From a paper:
G protein-coupled receptors (GPCRs) are ubiquitous cellular gatekeepers in eukaryotic organisms. Concurrent ligand exchange and crystallization is then initiated by overlaying a protein-laden LCP bolus with precipitant solution containing a large excess of the ligand of interest.
Two of these ligands (alprenolol and timolol) were selected to play the role of a transient ligand owing to their favorable kinetic properties. Two additional control plates were also set up: Control Plate A without any ligand in the precipitant solutions (negative control) and Control Plate B with the same transient ligand as that used during purification added to the precipitant solutions (positive control). Crystal quality also appears to depend on the identity of the transient ligand used for the exchange: the resolution of the structures based on alprenolol as a transient ligand is consistently lower compared with those based on timolol.
Author numbering: 31 to 230, 1002 to 1161, 263 to 342
Amino acid sequence: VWVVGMGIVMSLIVLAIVFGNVLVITAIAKFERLQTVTNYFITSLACADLVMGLAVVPFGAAHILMKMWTFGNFWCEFWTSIDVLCVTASIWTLCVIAVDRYFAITSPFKYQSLLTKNKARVIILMVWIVSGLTSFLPIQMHWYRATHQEAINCYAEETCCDFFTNQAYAIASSIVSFYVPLVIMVFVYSRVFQEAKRQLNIFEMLRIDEGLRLKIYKDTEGYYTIGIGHLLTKSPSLNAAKSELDKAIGRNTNGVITKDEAEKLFNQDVDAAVRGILRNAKLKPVYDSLDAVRRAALINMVFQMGETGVAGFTNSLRMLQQKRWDEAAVNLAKSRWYNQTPNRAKRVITTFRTGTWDAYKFCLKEHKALKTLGIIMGTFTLCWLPFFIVNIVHVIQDNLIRKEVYILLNWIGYVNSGFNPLIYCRSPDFRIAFQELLCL
Ligand SMILES: CC(C)CCC[C@@H](C)[C@H]1CC[C@H]2[C@@H]3CC=C4C[C@@H](O)CC[C@]4(C)[C@H]3CC[C@]12C
Ligand SMILES: C=CCc1ccccc1OC[C@@H](O)CNC(C)C
């Protein structure tokens, strides 16, 4: 009766992997906005999962339920070679993603890959050619084969497909195929998360706090705004707001502006906020006493409220100058501004308290993209590392291997081929593609 329940659960795992990855591949294959360098590697990853879901996981399920191998010794060696290829290719692709994200964040381009689609295609094809060679040749040439009697009996028997390996292979294949790219991926992507946080500036901080709209909108007070929190007029007239817009840009806008035009106004307003601080006798000394991070928090306040407005916080500024952060924070919380925009205020106040970008952590869309890619990496590790740790331990220790524990932990890694599509539901671009392909 256990076999029935086990059979259903296993069928749904197969179905969840297949449609899940087919959906992801179809989304990148058809939607123009999703044909990026990062998404080409995501396709390489989704292919390995689809291959795992169609050629590995179904035959694995059959081996458990029938308690025997009914496909012969040739498909057994081939099946094992494909499985290892899928794991090796999946982790090497995740390592490439990490290295590519590093080179991007360390470049002036910041979020765009330095690789071209042609180069990325070659990188992907080289990963599969190398992973194919490292995974098929030691299995086909029988370099993996153990010398103990129980293994030889399993090799000769056409109804035995128990992955018996010699200690050397179980160490060599594990290091080259998994541990080496994992160590590099974890070490490199921790630096990408570091650079994203360290390279956070006032412009990024304000694009988070104010947002971006190329259409005229009303703020909390009700004043007409455009771009990144650029107030057009205090007048309650759309024509009055459109006139000030046409005058500022220097063309017939009709209430709509370009991304290039939005950045133009933004660089002007930020520049005006910094200029205003230096001409203000009450803000200029506070600006000098502050560090790089806390200067942005003061520029942020002058951007939102204005030179005169911020200069009104005589008590708060005094303690910012005296470097008494926690004390300044209470007086900043005890204000009209904190009540008006509490989410934005809390962030700026935390910046003044901590002196770090911790409040603006993964708030930018480009930063959320790094988090999404970081989740994909982290899950793969949590799913495969227990199998690989218990694998390398039962090589040195020799005992406590079991079949029950080995297959179970291998299936923890198998279930991962169905998780990646669910994690892509974080990206709005993928979400928009999925609902279109599913007609919702
Ligand atoms: C089991 C073995 C024999 C089959 C392996 C499947 C191979 C053919 C698949 C898996 C991953 C695939 C790649 C995934 C990513 C891309 C990006 C896309 O923009 C062009 C094609 C390209 C470069 C694919 C080519 C074919 C590919 C290398
Ligand atoms: C020899 C250790 C296992 C191994 C090493 C390197 C790369 C992949 C590896 O194995 C992944 C497993 O999914 C294999 N599963 C068997 C075929 C049931």
